[PDB]
Amino acid sequence: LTQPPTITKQSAKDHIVDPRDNILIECEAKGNPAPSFHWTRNSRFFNIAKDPRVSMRRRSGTLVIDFRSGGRPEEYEGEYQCFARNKFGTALSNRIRLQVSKSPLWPKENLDPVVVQEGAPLTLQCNPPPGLPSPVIFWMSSSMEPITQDKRVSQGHNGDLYFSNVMLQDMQTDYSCNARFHFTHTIQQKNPFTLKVLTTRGVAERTPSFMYPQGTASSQMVLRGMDLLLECIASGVPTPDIAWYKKGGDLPSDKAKFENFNKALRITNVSEEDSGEYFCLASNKMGSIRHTISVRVKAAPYWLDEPKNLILAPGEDGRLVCRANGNPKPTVQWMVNGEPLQSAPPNPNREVAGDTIIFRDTQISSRAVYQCNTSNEHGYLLANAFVSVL
Amino acid sequence: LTQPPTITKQSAKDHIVDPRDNILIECEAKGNPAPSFHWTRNSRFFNIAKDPRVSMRRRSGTLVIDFRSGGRPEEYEGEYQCFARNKFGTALSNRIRLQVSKSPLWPKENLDPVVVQEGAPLTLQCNPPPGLPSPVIFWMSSSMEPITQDKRVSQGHNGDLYFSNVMLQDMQTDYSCNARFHFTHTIQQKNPFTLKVLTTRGVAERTPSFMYPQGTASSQMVLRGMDLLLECIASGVPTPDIAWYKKGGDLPSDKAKFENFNKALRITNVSEEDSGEYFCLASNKMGSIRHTISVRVKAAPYWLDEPKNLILAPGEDGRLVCRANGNPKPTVQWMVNGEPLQSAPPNPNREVAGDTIIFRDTQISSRAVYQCNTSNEHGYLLANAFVSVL
Ligand SMILES: *[C@@H]1O[C@H](CO)[C@@H](O)[C@H](O)[C@H]1NC(C)=O
Ligand SMILES: *[C@@H]1O[C@H](CO)[C@@H](O)[C@H](O)[C@H]1NC(C)=O
């Protein structure tokens, strides 16, 4: 009873949808003095009435936009912010980036027959088209027969297909890169590669050498929580065996798995403790080289102590503390009802100490919802906390 | 020397192109008094200058239209006719239908798990999207594993997948229809079908019954030259064996092949002699039913005697005969320089006998190119023949 708005459910920050279906932007509220809603397509006001196909909802501010007449969803891209308003304060939602899934065709590629000597390394670049999200890449023949992968032949994360050493039995099937898209079931293919393997004498043996990572070292930045992939692909004759190691300590036995044919290492859910230097060894027979990967880990803001709601009695004191850890250190910005706190209407019962807003002798005038935006180079955390007195 | 236009090479009537590449409409001429060209987008004049990206060519009227700035090829659809003009007459080209290849997404299909009893017939309709040309349909699992086909299970031309009788071992892989497009390498997929086979006692045996062709009889009209497919799919227990026959005569041993697992019969390059009644028998064990297909064959005009060029001496006689066989009988229409012969400028040396234009005492005034359009419900044959005197 008699309380400022509290958002219950809303859509994701990265709202991607296919052209096949209709638009459904969500935003559910909560509070006894019936909350009224209003969005803001981009950095300006959104008109629900002035546009026919768009419409709010009964007991909420959700959206439902179906295109029966015309209307292309490509004309609805942009950021969306929901506002649940009340006589006391205004609530905010994460600026939702509405985007449509794309399944682009490949560029005009006139591929020449690939002629390579037996035993020599070979890289066939896939170079897939953009699209949201990232497509799943796999290699099959033009006649739709799947290509078997092993220690000698496998694909990278970038989608390129690698040959440690080409055998005269590779001329059996051609090679076409396929791009499957997650949202809309669509596979896109590029022209097939034809191989011409040359027989000189037999197969000369040579020391191993890394193909995919260019050089002796590669650097990677991975955010906290996201998975971390390390790849070591090498060309040899008896085909190099990859062995993973970490400098100054063993690899997390529970948190690490060898994905490919030991060619790739995946550490899931990384933390600041996984930051370091990792390296792989390509053991052959004649020689053995090493690749050092420098992995630094940053972090999108995460709550250490999320600001909580205040339900006080007139005259009693309360605090709004908003702090989160992040790498680099996250900036704090408070907003009252969506309006910057630097330009907000004065209040003698309110005290701002940067990261903390303390209330002394709270009265029926300090009622409102406050927003805390922990701005970071890798992301943010928008918070909602209300102040209500009896 | 001193002669009316003669077209050497031109583009196909059904000119389909992908969005990936650029437009290249062709039209090459021939004649000493240098021929000048001009097209006609649809039933009106085409302006090469008024449009920037479009451009004719040096020693011809060919076209080359690349979109570097903007320009969507979807805005260039329509019929195109080339005109090679000369002081004596004007040549015509087939009205080229320029169209772009389409690879549409499937409609919103929320598929329920399919539950069927063991031994019962089952049809899973594919219902592919339009697109030009017709897509190649195949069935694979969602995990990209190919489905094996046999006498019991195979797909029709319509793309639908048929089960003569469902076995409890069908629950091994799911079923997703794939639509591969010829021009642009694109495969489109629909949601997978999940099977739930029910075991009652075992597998009851029943007489055969046709699944795909609805009823005891089906009618087909096939044009001359095009291939003719006949399909008989039947559901039985020991699985029906299809045997093909023709009423009143054997099937063309050299011109017929059994494509599927004897479920389909293909007669290539048909003629009026292949028109008749064909039927297949579905032999089982308990019973054996019959399906009669009535096949009538029509024909797009083909030359019996194509009009030839006249190279006469002033005073000598010559004829222009234009006749072609077709089903139904083709209409003849003559045009002088593209202008209807009913409204053309008079000529005392010219005689029109409907299908034949005879010239008596030809002089330096009857020089021109005449067009013969054998209009048929299934197509046409535009002809070019010139009259030149010394
Ligand atoms: C927080 O600040 C950042 C940087 O200006 C901005 O990108 C983000 O949208 C803000 N949070 C919200 C959703 O108000
Ligand atoms: C011949 O006549 C038919 C029917 O009017 C028409 O469709 C066709 O375009 C004509 N031939 C040409 C290309 O002039």
Q: How far is the CA of A12 from the centre of ligand 1 (A)?
A: 15
Nearest CA in chain A to B22: A108
Distance between CA atoms of residues A353 and A372, nearest Å: 13
Instruction: Collapse the DSSP code of B108 into the 3-class scheme (helix H, G, I; strand E, B; otherwise coil) and give the result.
Output: coil
Instruction: Collapse the DSSP code of A75 into the 3-class scheme (helix H, G, I; strand E, B; otherwise coil) and give the result.
Output: helix
Distance between CA atoms of residues B313 and B16, nearest Å: 44
Q: Which of B15, B43, B81, B95 has most ligand 2 atoms within 8 Å of its beta carbon, as the pocket-test mutant? A: B95
Residue nearest to atom 9 of ligand 1 (CA): A95
Task: State residue A73 phi and psi, 5-degree precision.
Answer: -65, -15
- DSSP conformation letters of A320-332: EE-EEEEESPPEE
Q: Do A107 and B20 touch (CB under 8 A)?
A: yes
Distance between CA atoms of residues B53 and B61, nearest Å: 15
Which residues' Cβ are closer than 6 Å to ligand 1?
A 94-95, 373, 375, 380, 382
- For chain A, the farthest-separated pair of C-alpha atoms sits apart, in whole angstroms, at 95
Q: Which positions ≥6 away from B197 have C-beta within 8 Å?
A: B116, B117, B118, B166, B167, B168, B170, B171
Query: In the structure encoding, which two tokens stand for residue A340, read together?
Result: 């910057």
Q: Are residues B83 and B7 in the same domain?
A: yes
Give alpha helix (H) positions in B286-384: none
Instruction: Collapse the DSSP code of B333 into the 3-class scheme (helix H, G, I; strand E, B; otherwise coil) and give the result.
Output: strand
Residue labelled with tokens 């642009």: B184
Task: State residue A310 phi and psi, 5-degree precision.
Answer: -110, 120
Distance between CA atoms of residues B165 and B120, nearest Å: 5
CA angle in degrees (0–180, nearest 5) for B136-B138-B140: 150
CB contact burial A116-148 (16+ within 10 A = b; e otherwise): eebbebbebebebeebbeebebbbbeeebeebe
Contact assessment for residue B114 and residue B193, using Cβ atoms and an 8 Å cutoff = yes
Nearest-CB residue to A184 (from B19, B20, B105):
B105
Residue (of B9, B204, B189) closest to B91 by Cα position: B9
**What is the length of chain A?**
390
CATH code, B367: 2.60.40.10
Residue labelled with tokens 């069927």: B116
Q: Do A105 and B189 touch (CB under 8 A)?
A: no
| Distances, alpha carbon A147 to alpha carbons A19, A170, B178, in Å | 32, 10, 19
Distance between CA atoms of residues B38 and A201, nearest Å: 62
Task: State residue A216 phi and psi, 5-degree precision.
Answer: -95, -20
Pairs of CB atoms within 8 A across A/B: 44
- According to DSSP, the residues that pair with B385 across neighbouring strands are B370
Q: Which positions ≥6 away from B72 have C-beta within 8 Å?
A: none
Q: Are residues A155 and A213 in the same domain?
A: no
Task: State residue B73 phi and psi, 5-degree precision.
Answer: -65, -15
Distance between CA atoms of residues A192 and A189, nearest Å: 9
Q: How far is the CA of B61 from the centre of ligand 2 (A)?
A: 21
Distance between CA atoms of residues A214 and A200, nearest Å: 28
**Which DSSP symbol is given to B43?**
T
- According to DSSP, the residues that pair with B136 across neighbouring strands are B180
Nearest-CB residue to A105 (from B105, B184, B188):
B184
Radius of gyration, CA atoms only, chain A: 28
Residue nearest to atom 6 of ligand 1 (CA): A375
Query: In the structure encoding, which two tokens stand for residue B373, read together?
Result: 């359009």
Q: How far is the CA of A94 from the centre of ligand 1 (A)?
A: 8
- Write the single-letter amino acid at A130: P
Contact assessment for residue B121 and residue B165, using Cβ atoms and an 8 Å cutoff = yes
For chain B, which residues lie within 8 Å of any Cβ of chain A, measuring from their own Cβ? 18-21, 105-108, 138, 144, 146, 176, 184-191
CA–centroid distance for A115 within its chain: 39
Distance between CA atoms of residues B185 and A187, nearest Å: 8
Distance between CA atoms of residues A86 and A207, nearest Å: 73
Nearest CA in chain A to B187: A187
Q: Do B186 and A184 touch (CB under 8 A)?
A: no
Q: Are residues B85 and B181 in the same domain?
A: no
CB contact burial A62-78 (16+ within 10 A = b; e otherwise): bbebeeeeebebeebeb
**Which DSSP symbol is given to B73?**
G
- According to DSSP, the residues that pair with A16 across neighbouring strands are A99
Distance between CA atoms of residues A126 and A159, nearest Å: 6
**Which DSSP symbol is given to A68?**
S
Query: In the structure encoding, which two tokens stand for residue B280, read together?
Result: 């297949």
A43: number of Cβ within 10 Å: 9
Q: Are residues B3 and B49 in the same domain?
A: yes
Q: Is the peptide bond before B135 cis (omega within 30 degrees of 0)?
A: no
Q: Do A105 and B19 touch (CB under 8 A)?
A: yes
Distance between CA atoms of residues B114 and B125, nearest Å: 12
- DSSP conformation letters of B86-137: -SS-EEE---EEEEE---PPPP---PPPEEEETT--EEE-------SSPPEE
DSSP E strands, B40-92: 78-80, 83-85, 90-92
Among B300, B326, B346, give the residue marking a domain's end. Answer: B300
| Distances, alpha carbon A210 to alpha carbons A233, A244, A260, A283, in Å | 6, 14, 16, 11
Nearest-CB residue to B108 (from A20, A105, A106):
A20
Distance between CA atoms of residues A185 and A189, nearest Å: 13
Contact assessment for residue B303 and residue B226, using Cβ atoms and an 8 Å cutoff = no
Which residues' Cβ are closer than 6 Å to ligand 2?
B 94-95, 373, 375, 380, 382
A154 membership: H or E segment, kind and range? strand A153-155
Q: Are residues B115 and B170 in the same domain?
A: yes
For chain A, which residues lie within 8 Å of any Cβ of chain B, measuring from their own Cβ? 18-21, 105-108, 138, 144, 146, 176, 184-191
Query: In the structure encoding, which two tokens stand for residue B270, read together?
Result: 């048909």
What is the sign, positive or negative, of the torsion defined by CA atoms of B104, B109, B115, B117?
A: negative
Range of the structural domain that residue A66 is part of: 1-100
Q: Which of A43, A334, A373 has most ligand 1 atoms within 8 Å of its beta carbon, as the pocket-test mutant? A: A373
A365: number of Cβ within 10 Å: 13
Distance between CA atoms of residues B17 and B324, nearest Å: 31
- Write the single-letter amino acid at B260: N
Distance between CA atoms of residues A112 and A39, nearest Å: 54
- According to DSSP, the residues that pair with A235 across neighbouring strands are A209
Q: Are residues A109 and A171 in the same domain?
A: yes
What is the sign, positive or negative, of the torsion defined by CA atoms of A164, A167, A171, A173?
A: negative
Q: Is the peptide bond before A133 cis (omega within 30 degrees of 0)?
A: yes
Residue labelled with tokens 């004759």: A237
- Write the single-letter amino acid at A266: R
B110: number of Cβ within 10 Å: 5
Distance between CA atoms of residues A290 and A293, nearest Å: 10
Task: Report the DSSP pairing between strands B14-17 and B96-100.
Answer: parallel
- According to DSSP, the residues that pair with B283 across neighbouring strands are B241, B288
Distance between CA atoms of residues B168 and B117, nearest Å: 9
CA angle in degrees (0–180, nearest 5) for B82-B83-B88: 160
- Write the single-letter amino acid at A44: R
Task: State residue B76 phi and psi, 5-degree precision.
Answer: -115, 15
Q: Are residues A95 and A134 in the same domain?
A: no
Query: In the structure encoding, which two tokens stand for residue B88, read together?
Result: 């004596």
Instruction: Collapse the DSSP code of A172 into the 3-class scheme (helix H, G, I; strand E, B; otherwise coil) and give the result.
Output: helix
| Distances, alpha carbon A134 to alpha carbons A104, A300, B131, B187, in Å | 12, 21, 26, 17
Instruction: Collapse the DSSP code of B235 into the 3-class scheme (helix H, G, I; strand E, B; otherwise coil) and give the result.
Output: strand
Torsion of CA B336, B337, B342, B344, to 10 degrees: -100
Ligand nearest to the CA of B379: 2
Residue labelled with tokens 């535009």: B382
Distance between CA atoms of residues A208 and A229, nearest Å: 22
Q: Which positions ≥6 away from A55 have C-beta within 8 Å?
A: A48, A63, A64, A65
Contact assessment for residue B157 and residue B264, using Cβ atoms and an 8 Å cutoff = yes
- According to DSSP, the residues that pair with B29 across neighbouring strands are none
Q: Are residues A309 and A366 in the same domain?
A: yes
CA angle in degrees (0–180, nearest 5) for A260-A262-A266: 70
Ligand nearest to the CA of A372: 1
Distance between CA atoms of residues B360 and B379, nearest Å: 33
Q: Do B105 and A186 touch (CB under 8 A)?
A: yes
CB contact burial B343-353 (16+ within 10 A = b; e otherwise): ebeeeeebeee
Distance between CA atoms of residues B66 and B16, nearest Å: 16
B84 sits in the region (left: phi over 0; alpha: psi -120 to 50; else beta) called beta
Among B241, B273, B300, give the residue marking a domain's end. Answer: B300
- Write the single-letter amino acid at B3: Q
Distance between CA atoms of residues A382 and B32, nearest Å: 79
Q: How far is the CA of B373 from the centre of ligand 2 (A)?
A: 6
Task: State residue B240 phi and psi, 5-degree precision.
Answer: -60, 140
How many domains does one find in chain B? 4
Nearest-CB residue to B186 (from A20, A107, A188):
A188
Task: State residue A172 phi and psi, 5-degree precision.
Answer: -75, -40
Distance between CA atoms of residues B341 and B351, nearest Å: 11
Task: Report the DSSP pairing between strands B161-163 and B176-181.
Answer: unpaired
Q: What is the 3-state secondary structure (H, E, C) of B190-232?
A: CCCECEEEECCCCCCCCCCEECCCCCCEEEEEEECCCCEEEEC
- According to DSSP, the residues that pair with A245 across neighbouring strands are A279
Instruction: Collapse the DSSP code of B186 into the 3-class scheme (helix H, G, I; strand E, B; otherwise coil) and give the result.
Output: strand
A368: number of Cβ within 10 Å: 22
Q: Which positions ≥6 away from A112 have C-beta within 8 Å?
A: none
Distance between CA atoms of residues B234 and A351, nearest Å: 83
Distance between CA atoms of residues B252 and B257, nearest Å: 9
B374: number of Cβ within 10 Å: 24
Q: Are residues A276 and A318 in the same domain?
A: no
* Residues in chain A that come right before a backbone break, where C and next N are over 2.5 Å apart: none
CA angle in degrees (0–180, nearest 5) for B383-B389-B390: 145
Among B191, B206, B221, give the residue marking a domain's end. Answer: B206
Q: Are residues A18 and A93 in the same domain?
A: yes
Q: What is the 3-state secondary structure (H, E, C) of A287-306?
A: CEEEEEEEEEEEEEEEEEEC
**Which DSSP symbol is given to B187?**
E
Atom of ligand 1 nearest to the CA of A335: 14
Torsion of CA B132, B137, B140, B142, to 10 degrees: 30
Q: Which positions ≥6 away from A51 have C-beta within 8 Å?
A: none
Query: Cβ contacts (< 8 Å) between A20 and chain B: which residues?
Result: 105-108
Distance between CA atoms of residues A7 and A374, nearest Å: 18
Residue (of A263, A207, A272) closest to A232 by Cα position: A263
Contact assessment for residue A330 and residue A301, using Cβ atoms and an 8 Å cutoff = yes
Distance between CA atoms of residues A247 and B367, nearest Å: 92
Distance between CA atoms of residues A30 and A28, nearest Å: 7
Q: Which positions ≥6 away from B62 have C-beta within 8 Å?
A: B24, B25, B26, B27, B28, B56
Q: Which positions ≥6 away from A15 have C-beta within 8 Å?
A: A25, A80, A96, A97, A98, A99
Q: Which positions ≥6 away from A68 have C-beta within 8 Å?
A: A53
Q: Are residues B189 and B259 in the same domain?
A: no
Residue (of A299, A298, A252) closest to A278 by Cα position: A252
Ligand nearest to the CA of A338: 1
Q: Are residues A11 and A88 in the same domain?
A: yes
CB contact burial B159-194 (16+ within 10 A = b; e otherwise): bbbbbbbbbeebeebbbbbbbbbbbbbbbbbbbbbe
- Write the single-letter amino acid at B387: V
Nearest CA in chain B to A19: B105
Ligand nearest to the CA of B373: 2
Residue nearest to atom 4 of ligand 1 (CA): A375
Distance between CA atoms of residues A213 and A292, nearest Å: 10
**Which DSSP symbol is given to A8?**
-
A338 sits in the region (left: phi over 0; alpha: psi -120 to 50; else beta) called left
Instruction: Among A103, A137, A185, pick the best mutation site for testing chain B contact (most B Cβ within 10 A).
Output: A185
Query: In the structure encoding, which two tokens stand for residue A126, read together?
Result: 């896939």
- Write the single-letter amino acid at A62: T
Distance between CA atoms of residues A82 and A6, nearest Å: 12
